[model samples]
Structure formats: C-alpha cells, structure tokens
Target: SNANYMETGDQRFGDLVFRQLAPNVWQHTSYLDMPGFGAVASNGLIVRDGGRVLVVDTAWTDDQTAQILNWIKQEINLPVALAVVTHAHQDKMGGMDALHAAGIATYANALSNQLAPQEGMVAAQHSLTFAANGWVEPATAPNFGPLKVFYPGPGHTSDNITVGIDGTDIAFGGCLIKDSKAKSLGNLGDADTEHYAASARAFGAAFPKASMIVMSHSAPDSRAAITHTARMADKLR
Candidate 1:
C-alpha cells in the first residue's frame, strides 16, 4: 500500500501532492517554508503519455523527487521515462541527481546546460545539475515526446521554457508567467525584464487559444494568467 496516497483525490508522496487538472494532466505541488514566504508551494507537472510519464521539473529536493517518483511508478505502474528542466534554478534542477540515480534521463535548454556548472552545479557529485544529456535544441518550435516545449525568449530566467500539452491544449509557462492575482514579476534576480515583454508576446501569439495555462507556482487557468505576467513586465519597465 502507498502510504502517501491521499483520500482527497490528491496523490501524495511525502510533501508532494499531485492535483489532476484534466484526464492525463496534473499539477504537482510541494511546500517548503521559506524565510518570508511562510510556506511556498513549488509546482511541477506530470504529463502521462501512454505508459510513460514526462516530468517537467522535479520537486524542491532530492528527497522529495525520490518519493514523488516512487509514488508515480507505484500508482501509475509506469516509469517516468523522460524528464526536463525548464531552467537551471534549484527549484527546477535541484533533484536532477535523484532522477539520474533512478536512471531517469533529463534535458534542459542550451543556456541551462551551460550555466549548470557555473551556477554551482557539479553534475557528477549529486542531484544539482542536468543529466549527461546535452542541451535541448533551440528550434523555432521543438517538442518533447507528445508535448511541445518552446523557448519564448527571456523573462523569469534566460533559459526559461514554456511546455505545451496538445492533449488538453494547456501550456505550462514555467516561471515566465505569473498567477492570476500576481501583482509583480515575483522574482527578478535572474530575469531579463527588458526583454520579458517580447518573450511573452512570442509565446502568446503561439498559443493564443490554449484552453488552460499553468504558471510555475500557481493553479492552472486560462490564457489570462499569461497577460498578468505581460502586464507586470510593462509596468515594471
């Protein structure tokens, strides 16, 4: 029996809880109490394709990823065949090692792969860096398996990428997009605020009719969520 399974329809594995958004789309949330944010819920996605799963960014830590993957394999009876990191941030690739340890391969954008080591990630030592797999080609519109992962310029981070699931017409905006009630760009430590608007517009034009758009740390909703980020980018500039 899976001890982490929740009765509230939320599949739980340790601190990670997956909330289904559609038939095969889910938003996984993991909470970590931070200094000023109280409990920050970091989000990822689980896209089930046939018997394989595509993990878009892991949890907050290796421990969390370990349990999350275990629950996935146990409950779904399917392996997380392929995984990818939207950026090089800890919240994204922090669990790369644990995934790799489990023999799960992961990929990232060109800049993310290049900056992993400089950003204090020694891939050989632990789960801090992307897998040995090389950089994801920067095509006009490249896809991952059945999902479309596109580079929409720079916003939250230079390497931030938006993931689109055709099955449900939903796009995971990574950190480039803000939640519905977001007032600002959230964090700009690694952001390219100047070019943020252009980047967002690029994405908007591409997926104008996306039924549901998901932000990194927010609940999945309509394309209006993306407008929030674009508006903030304009105001901030």
Candidate 2:
C-alpha cells in the first residue's frame, strides 16, 4: 500500500496547516475570518530542491507567513532561497512584509508589483515582465529556480499569474482558475470580465500536461479543473 509514495502527515502552525503533495512539494494553507464569509482558507506551495526551497505565494497575513518561514527552517531544515507571488491579492502576497523580514528574495509579475501597494500589501523585491501573449518562461529569462510564472491575460485580477513547477506536472493556478466545485468565478472586483474566458483558455493551453493544478481557496485538482474554469469564464463573456 505504501509502495507508491510516502505519507509525511500534516503539520500545523497555529491557524496554518502544511500538507505534503509530492516528495519535495508541500501545500501550505491559512485561514482568514471574513466578516460575512466566516473563515476562508487560502493555499500556497512550498517546493524543496536539495538544501534550499522556493515558495509559491504566501499566507493571508504577516504572522501566518512568519509561521510558514519558521516551519521551513525547523521542519524542512532548508532555507527559502526565493518566493514567487502569483498575484497582488492579499491571499497571494499579503505576507510580503514577513517574507521581506526573513530576508528572502521575492519575485512577481511587473504588473503585480505595481498593483500590490495599492492592494495594501508590499510588492515583491523583483519583477518580471510577460510577453505580448501574457506568458513568461525560464527559457526566455531566469525564473524562481524551477518555477515558471505566467500571466494568462487577467481573469480573477489583471495582475494575476500562474506558477508551474519545472520538470513536473504540477501548477499553481492561483486565483485565476477555480476548482471543480466552484459554481462561478469567486471574485470579480478586480477582474477583466471581457478577457476572463480567453485568459482561462490561455492558462489551459499553457499547461496542458499539468495533472495537479493548485488553486488559492480550494483543494488541488486535475487538469480537468482548467477546462472547467474556462467554461465557467465563458459564461461571463
């Protein structure tokens, strides 16, 4: 039964929880009590390579982010070499200050960094620009170690992007793509309704081979989630 893979179990840090996905990948989730929505959870990714690791996105607050950093050092026993924020939303980069305090390098799309401060969060230390088609790969320029960042033309937010793990079939859709259970797009406050459908399609086209697609507010799902999200966005357009 345990021949396929090993189960390391879940680790908790206050309101945050960390669960291993693959041998070197862990999903970190944190909760926030919204006024009317009660407690909402958000997810991020922690990928380790050798003695160092890279984080995709952050928790909802500085304290939560700090806990994640501590867990990495104490449990993972690895230094965070870099972090890449997929968007400017609080769920994605609200812990920028914590990351900065840890002296960890952070990266995000140029547009995300520009909008981060406006969203009441600190911007990433480094920024990368996407091409006209709204995508950037390590082949064109350096990325956050093995993670490739892509802007799929703005669905959930204009600055939203996706993080795909290199040499693996895993991708973090951030807030751009929703899980299978989502009835509709979650938030449209900062969304580009006109381009939402196209963006979702772009995201699917970008990671056709991605079997594990991680979302911000839901559990990870398969590539079918991408097509499901695209169909949901189509209704908006």
Candidate 3:
C-alpha cells in the first residue's frame, strides 16, 4: 500500500530533482558544490492539500528555489502558502529571497532567524516562537497547517528544528537526524556535541510512528536513522 508512493526518478528542474513520496507529498533534491565534497545534494519537501501548498526547505540558491516555485505554480497548479526552514544554514534557507519574491510567507524558529544573517543566509519573514523546550504544536501554529515543528535541544545547529507532517508517517529531520549511510557526524563546526545525543533521542521520541525520515543531505530512511544519529552523537560525546 505505502510502497505505491515510494517511486523515484520522476521529474527534474536543472539540478533539482523531485520525487513523489506520497499522494500529496514530494521530495526535492538540489546540489551544492563543496570544496572537498564536490557537488553535495540536499533534500526538502513539498506538500500540498487542496488549493494550497507548503515547502519545508529551499534549494541551495535563489535560482534553484525559483525553479521549484515555478514548478509548484505551473505543474502543481497551487499557490505556495507557507515555507519553513529547519535551521539557519544555507542549505535550509538559501532560497529565502526567491520565496519572498514569490510572495510566499516564510517561517523558522526565532533563534534561527536571529542566527541566519550571521551565517550568511537570509532570515525568514516570520518567526515561530516556541516554548522553553523549543516545541511548537500544530494546534497553536495554524499558519503551518498540519506541520508540527520541534527543536530537540539542538544538534546540527543551535536553532535546528525537525518538522513532522501530521496525519502521515513522514517527518523532515532536516540535517539533525543523519542518514543511515553517514560515516561521520559530517560537520561539527556549529554542533552541540554534548547535547546532540539527547537531541536525537528526543527527536525519535517525539515521532515514534515516523517510519519515513527525510533528511537534507541524503535519501529518506526509516526511523532507525534517528537512532543511528543518536548513537553517533553518543559516541562523539
């Protein structure tokens, strides 16, 4: 049943590739050239319901993001009502200008917005103020529709967040929850190594039923990927 939506190699827009993950859920992958890693790809989600759509993260650049916006308007025939970047990193909000140009409302943690410009990334238009533990329930966040955003005490970045798509078993772990094949923690320049393990554990606990975990730098995997990340972080500590 769920295997029907697991098809890939569907559509591409230049460097961005879109794969259908479910009836109204699509995963978009875009690449960024790194000095040592060559062209590294990052993933985001495009979810639609009825006449409106929502984007989880942006491509690595404005040009790439514009292509995504165009596809949503032309191919999906829906207006992107909201966008949420999971962190302050470029891979998450690099295409913020393009989203703004398209008149799409953007959102991120207030801490992320504050730290974005410092990291050379554009800040989101709106700030989602969370509780002390950095958890924002879907009931209070009407603008985000069915998405539930949670900050599990920071792993990849101090303001990093995980987005759970309500009513589905899919959750966007962003860059916090690593893919199963990740050899190392990847980058730790801005990581909270001491708390990373706890953060990953909290993320897993928050979404016990999330079988599909979508990450930024790799293919989607099962919730065990979250456990993998927790173990890795624990070893690092």
The candidate that wins on lDDT is: 3
Residue 4 accuracy (lDDT) in model 3: 56
Show the lowest summed lDDT stretch of 10 residues, model 2: 1-10
Order of quality (lDDT): 3, 2, 1
Q: What would the per-residue lDDT of candidate 3 be over residues 145-199, giving only the tens digit for each residue?
A: 7788888887988898888888778988888888877888877899999999998
What are the RMSD figures for all models against the true structure?
5.2, 2.4, 2.5
lDDT (Cα, tens digit) per residue for candidate 1, span 1-237: 323435346666677888877677778787777787787777888888887888887877888888778878776778787787788877777787898889876777757777788775424221222222222243522235657767787778887877778768888888888876887777789989798987877777767668788877777767887777787888757
Q: Is candidate 1 or candidate 3 better by lDDT?
A: 3
- Alpha-carbon lDDT, every model: 0.73, 0.84, 0.86
Q: TM-score for each prediction?
A: 0.86, 0.93, 0.93
Instruction: Flag regions of model 3 displaced more than 4 Å.
Output: 1-8, 137-140
Worst 10 residues of 1 by lDDT: 125-134
For residue 64, model 1's alpha carbon misses the true position, in angstroms, by 0.5
Q: Give lDDT tens digits, candidate 2, residues 1-237.
A: 112455345777778888777767889999999888899989999999777899988999999999999888877888899888888888888899999989998888888889887888899988878788767845533535667777888789988888788777888888888888788788788989889989888888888888899998898998878889888888887
How many residue pairs clash in model 1? 1
